[PDB]
Symmetry: D2
């Protein structure tokens, strides 16, 4: 048996147990800024990822782990109608490096599906690319930017969101939920996927986010709190 848990109520500028890539960085306020913020306004062409230092044993060939994770984020926008591109929580191999920005969220290099990405991601996509449905949406990505499944949702800017993602091993279900606590709205999605055909035994977990490739088509991507727990029986 094996277990890994961790939780953050706020981050520090010198979070030695977090791996920060590209522009990610932590405020002097304790908030984790995935994408760059200059004046107090989002910048375009930005990419940032944050990973937890230790790999988690997510399966051992014959048995799968269960896991639960909760986080809360905030997106601000100078113009709530021209925004991009989104954030994602993901799982991938321990040696994962940033990919292409803009629409690819730093998780892929192009629009093809490729078994070698070995990446599973849950995305909150705010810019309709050619591979997207024409509305803001949540999507489950198995090895590609073109989701396995998506559902519509309405972003509320300036409002702290609460996310919960769970994977039950006995049914091999991965479920995600999103609630806007003050606005009182919630959205949920579920798919089955056997992690043993997709991932290596050990992965790293974390966040990724990008801003649009043009001026004014832009938004913040802040992580506010984060907790995670796994169990391998």
């Amino acid at each position: 048996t094996e277990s890994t848990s961790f939780s953050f109520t706020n981050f520090n500028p010198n979070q030695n147990n977090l791996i920060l890539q590209e522009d990610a960085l932590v405020n002097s306020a304790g908030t984790l800024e995935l994408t760059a913020v200059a004046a107090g306004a989002p910048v375009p062409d930005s990419l940032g990822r944050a990973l937890y230092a230790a790999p988690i044993h997510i399966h051992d060939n014959t048995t799968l782990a269960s896991f639960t994770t909760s986080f809360s984020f905030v997106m601000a926008a100078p113009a709530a109608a021209a925004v991009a591109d989104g954030l994602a929580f993901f799982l991938a191999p321990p040696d994962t490096q940033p990919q292409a920005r803009g629409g690819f969220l730093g998780l892929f290099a192009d629009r093809a599906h490729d078994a070698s990405y070995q990446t599973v991601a849950v995305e909150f996509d705010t810019y309709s690319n050619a591979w997207d449905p024409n509305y803001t949406h949540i999507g489950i990505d198995t090895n590609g930017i073109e989701s396995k499944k998506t559902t519509p949702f309405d972003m509320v800017y300036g409002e702290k969101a609460n996310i919960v993602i769970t994977y039950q091993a006995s049914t091999k279900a991965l479920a995600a939920s999103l609630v806007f606590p003050v606005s009182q709205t919630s959205y949920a999605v579920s798919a089955r996927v056997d992690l043993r055909d997709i991932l290596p035994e050990y992965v790293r977990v974390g966040f990724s986010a990008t801003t649009g490739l043009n001026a004014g088509v832009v938004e913040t991507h802040d992580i506010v709190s984060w907790s995670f727990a796994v169990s391998l029986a």
Copy 2:
């Protein structure tokens, strides 16, 4: 700081840490049968309730507690169309006793709202009464059977369901999600409610269920697993 937590992966006929009211009972297969089962058939006119033996501290007048709970259930039915009445997870005063059966779920005596009930419930409602919407639903009940908010959902008889209910003290958000892992469908609702105004400091928690009042309009109400956690920081 105060916390409570418990989990059951299955039950035992002599579960002295549960309080079983009316018909509720535990199987030879270790499954909590809230309502009565004759051969392998649900009997009508049944009422069951099961509570945790320890009262829990859900608020101290000025501060609210956070809590999360997970349970799984199964409803079975000889006839998928003649069904009633549903099951519910609830919070109430420690000395709570069963109320009326049928569409009242063993939680209320009639259909009027009344602050003296001091009860909060998330209901899984399978039969439309005069006070219901005309479709299968999940509702949040605050001191009454007439829900204060509902959303539609479609049952899947014969399939284990996963439910998660979280309460976040800082935003007073009550949120529920329900997933059919095998059929891959999920539903979510959320409301804002200040428990300090509704409940006493200490409550007991658990489930209540009822079968319909007429022969042949009936379903089982089995609880398969359950876990709970509270934090009063």
Copy 3:
């Protein structure tokens, strides 16, 4: 599998999830006072016990649960020279009632060993009765006041002490350690005992304590904090 856990960093005078017996009572300052305190002084002839409300599943005939519990207490004495009688942590049948005061610590009726007590206790004994070693001591009581095993220790009055008691199921070992963190001294005992032969499947756990029967041979018995976890795999 079943789990049970709770923690208290401080108490409330109306702690509905504890069972207060005889003299036990909680201060306006949140300190559990097991034996009576008049103006700042402990009273003689005092007896008091406190238990967590929910029974816990400690064995099921074939398998033992493992458990861990931590608590801190303080003893205050007008004269460190004449003190009695001590405090004990114990497991017992859910319906357990207080027995004799004084040297029996509210756990037993007289000095005989009787398998029907179904009581196991770890005691901090501050007065040498005829059935005791001549020195202050920690003791392990199996169905009787006359300890099955003891080690000597010296009480430091006025200092908050830290106690940790663990039972490991696979080796059937019961272990206790005590540390006075500021004075920097520590004590420890262990012994092997199969609970399936002694206790019923379900038990309540808690503390018990008493003062001397003669004016002036007295001390306080204050529980300041408490946490517990059990796991039955």
Copy 4:
């Protein structure tokens, strides 16, 4: 607030979440052989270390964290009176590297007390060096191999032992206890140490062990299970 926890009931040869140094390796049976084992006998001159991948946040300059760790080990020896050199659990800067073998257990280079070590350790010492007492002992190393405090203890080769180390912030108490369950003997030690003055904000945790520098003066140093939890309020 931040937390970190993990636990291993057994290990795997490809434990990517552990950092293995020098000779450290994992058996085909799931035991972490800190020091080399050739036929079925220990090897002289061996040095092994193992750390958890993620650094842990032990303080933020003003507030200290609390922590609890539990592990089990087994030492085997061909000849009970020709054994060396012992094993240790420790905290050190994230980029800690192995030091001198033999009686330094791989934590120190010589025998001075240099504050630039930034290392705290609890050793189980099996061979008397010049700086040691003339008996097997548990010692508390703060920035040097010459323990700041020790107590005697009698080893029991072949028997699995249980160690529990707890650090408490409010009192700045470090406390160790060791139990030989089947043999029913236990030992304990405690000391007061402010980790803000010794350790950096983030440290790694783990075990180190060495065999004797001379042919035949040897013993194995195996880790069977390990559990760890921290909280920085």
